[PDB]
Design an enzyme around this catalytic site. Sequence first.
Site, PDB file in Angstrom:
ATOM      1  N   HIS A  41       0.854  -1.224   0.000  1.00 54.24           N
ATOM      2  CA  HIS A  41       0.000   0.000   0.000  1.00 54.24           C
ATOM      3  C   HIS A  41       0.882   1.264   0.000  1.00 54.24           C
ATOM      4  O   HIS A  41       0.309   2.378  -0.097  1.00 54.24           O
ATOM      5  CB  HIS A  41      -1.069  -0.044   1.118  1.00 54.24           C
ATOM      6  N   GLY A 143       2.457   6.307   9.498  1.00 50.25           N
ATOM      7  CA  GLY A 143       3.895   6.209   9.193  1.00 50.25           C
ATOM      8  C   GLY A 143       4.561   4.993   9.831  1.00 50.25           C
ATOM      9  O   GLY A 143       5.756   4.764   9.503  1.00 50.25           O
ATOM     10  N   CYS A 145       3.595   1.814   9.373  1.00 47.64           N
ATOM     11  CA  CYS A 145       3.439   0.607   8.515  1.00 47.64           C
ATOM     12  C   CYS A 145       4.830   0.158   8.042  1.00 47.64           C
ATOM     13  O   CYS A 145       5.707   1.022   7.872  1.00 47.64           O
ATOM     14  CB  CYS A 145       2.464   0.845   7.365  1.00 47.64           C
TER      15      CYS A 145
END
EC number: 3.4.19.12
Lengths: 304, 304
Positions: A41, A143, A145
Site C-alpha cells: 500500500h 507512518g 506501517c
Amino acid sequence: SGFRKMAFPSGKVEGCMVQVTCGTTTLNGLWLDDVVYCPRHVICTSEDMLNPNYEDLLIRKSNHNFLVQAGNVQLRVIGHSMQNCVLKLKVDTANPKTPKYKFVRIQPGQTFSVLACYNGSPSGVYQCAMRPNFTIKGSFLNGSCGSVGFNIDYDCVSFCYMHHMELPTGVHAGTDLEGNFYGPFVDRQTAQAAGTDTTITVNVLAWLYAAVINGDRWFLNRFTTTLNDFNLVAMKYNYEPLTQDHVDILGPLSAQTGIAVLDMCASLKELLQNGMNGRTILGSALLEDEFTPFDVVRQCSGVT
Amino acid sequence: SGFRKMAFPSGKVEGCMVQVTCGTTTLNGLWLDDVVYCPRHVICTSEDMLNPNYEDLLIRKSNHNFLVQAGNVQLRVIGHSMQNCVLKLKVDTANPKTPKYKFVRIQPGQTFSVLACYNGSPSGVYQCAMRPNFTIKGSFLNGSCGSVGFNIDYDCVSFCYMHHMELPTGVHAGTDLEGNFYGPFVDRQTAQAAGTDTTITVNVLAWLYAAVINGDRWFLNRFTTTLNDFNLVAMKYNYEPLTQDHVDILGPLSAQTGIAVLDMCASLKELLQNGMNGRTILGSALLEDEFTPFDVVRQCSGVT
Ligand SMILES: Fc1cccc(CNCc2ccco2)c1
Ligand SMILES: Fc1cccc(CNCc2ccco2)c1
C-alpha cells in the site's frame, strides 16, 4: 527474581529498518541482503486505499519511483515485485547489518517483539501476542506501517509480522514476510471487524507458573480438574480451549514447580469463577496471556 | 492508536555490553570509550559479600585480574579505579560502537529501559520506573549485575542505572553510572528493607490522558478538585503528593485533550474511592504508573 513483559533486544532489527517513499506515501521497509520488504500500500494515495487494484496501480510504477533511504543514504532500486501484500524491492547493495534470519508464520497465541518505526527510524520496542482473532494490540501511529514483529533464537532473527492496517476498533492487522495477512484482513480502507478476542489459556497458565516461581502463590487452591471440565469453564469465559499439546508444552513448568498442569488449570478455573477479589498476581489485577510457556522458561532460566 | 509499555530500541546499548570476570565472579560491564564500568562487587566471593571492605579487597587486585570480553575477544585492562560502588576499568581499545552518551541521576518516578544481560550478552529489554522508595521492580537472575538502565534523546544514550542488588523482598537496587546507589542501599548481603512503594501520581495521570487519547473514556467524571483536596485522598491511598511542578508537566496532555489537570485529578480521586468495578483502562485492571508525561507525549506523537 521479578517477572517483566520483556522484548528481545532490537539491535539486529534496528540495522534492517529503512524508509520507503513512493510518491507522497512514506513508510518503513525491512532491508535483508539486497531486498527491501514493505507494505504494498506504499503505492496508494489514501484515495487509492478505499478500493485499490494493486496490480493496476503497480503498472504505473518503475524501480526509480521507489525511494529507499537507509540512514541518510539512498539505495538504488534495480527491481521490484509484489508477493501477496508486500513489495520486494531489489537494491544494488546487500545490507551490511543483515543478521541471520528466517521468515516464519506464527500461530495465534505466539508472542513476538515489535520495533515500532517512523520514516525508517526506530521509536520503541514492545512485546505482543498474535490474538486468537489474528489481530494484535499494538501501538502504531500513521507512518508506522512496515514496522516488523520478530523473535530471536541466539543469533537468528525470525521475522513473523509486518504492520499494515489499523481496524476501525484501533486493533492492528498485518502480514507474515511473504505478504500473507494474519486472519481474513485485506489491505483496504473498508469496514473490517475482528472476531472474538479470546484469552490465550496456555499463556495464562505459563504466567501462573511464572508467578508461583516468583513467590506469588495466594491463588494456588486445593482442587484439580480435567481438560474436558476445564474446557467447559474456559468456553464460558472466552478462554481458548486447552489441548494435550498445551499440557505437553507446560510440562517443564509443571516439573520445576511440582504443580501438575491440571491442578494449575483448577487454580485458573477458581480465579475465573471467583475473580481476583482486589488482589494482584505479578503486580497485575487481570490474568496476563502475552507470555508463552517458552517465554516463561526463557526469562526464568536467563537465556541470551 | 493503541498504547503499549514501550522500551527504547536497545541496539546502541547492546554494542556497549561486555563480560567482566574477577576470579570466579562474572557479571556485565558497560564499555564506553576506553572505560568498562561494572559493579565493584565483581571482586567479591559471595562469602566476601556478607561484610566486604572493597578498598582492602581491591589491594589484592591488579589490572590483569580483571578479564573483559567483548564478543569473544579479550580487552587489555591498562588501569582500574573504584568510584563509589562501580569499578572503572581502563582498556587499551576505545569501544567502536560507543554511542553519544551522558550519565544522569534520575528522580523517583522517572522511567527508563533495562537491557537485561548475562555474561555480557543481552537477553531482553523492558521499561521500568525508579520507585519512590528508590527500588525498581526488575527481572534479574544471578549474573544480571552490571545490566544498565537508559533513556535515548534522538542519538544520545543517557545511562541512569546499573544493576547491583536484589533485596530479600525480590525488588532491585542499583547505582547511577558514578556508582552512587539510588536510595539508602549498600552493596552488601545484609537485611535491607525498602520503604513504602507509593504510586507515582503524576505518571497515573499521564496514563489517564493516554487512555482518553486512545478512546478509553468511561472513567471521566463530572467533578474537579484542588491540589490540597486531591493530596489528602492521595496520602490515604499511598499515592505520591501532586505538586504544581507535576501540573505544569501535564499541561500539554491537558491542552491536547481539553481535560484540565485538576478535573483528571478528580477522575483519579473517584477511581481511588470507587475502584474499577471490574472495568479496565488500556487493558489494565489497575492504574499504571510507569509512563511519565514525556513518555505519553513521545508515544502518542511518534518521536524517533
Ligand atoms: F552485505 C551483507 C549481506 C548479508 C550479511 C552481511 C553481514 N552481516 C553482518 C552483521 C550481523 C549483524 C550485524 O552485522 C553483509
Ligand atoms: F573508538 C571509538 C570511540 C568512541 C566512538 C566511536 C564511534 N562510535 C560510532 C557508533 C555509534 C553507534 C555505533 O557506532 C569509536
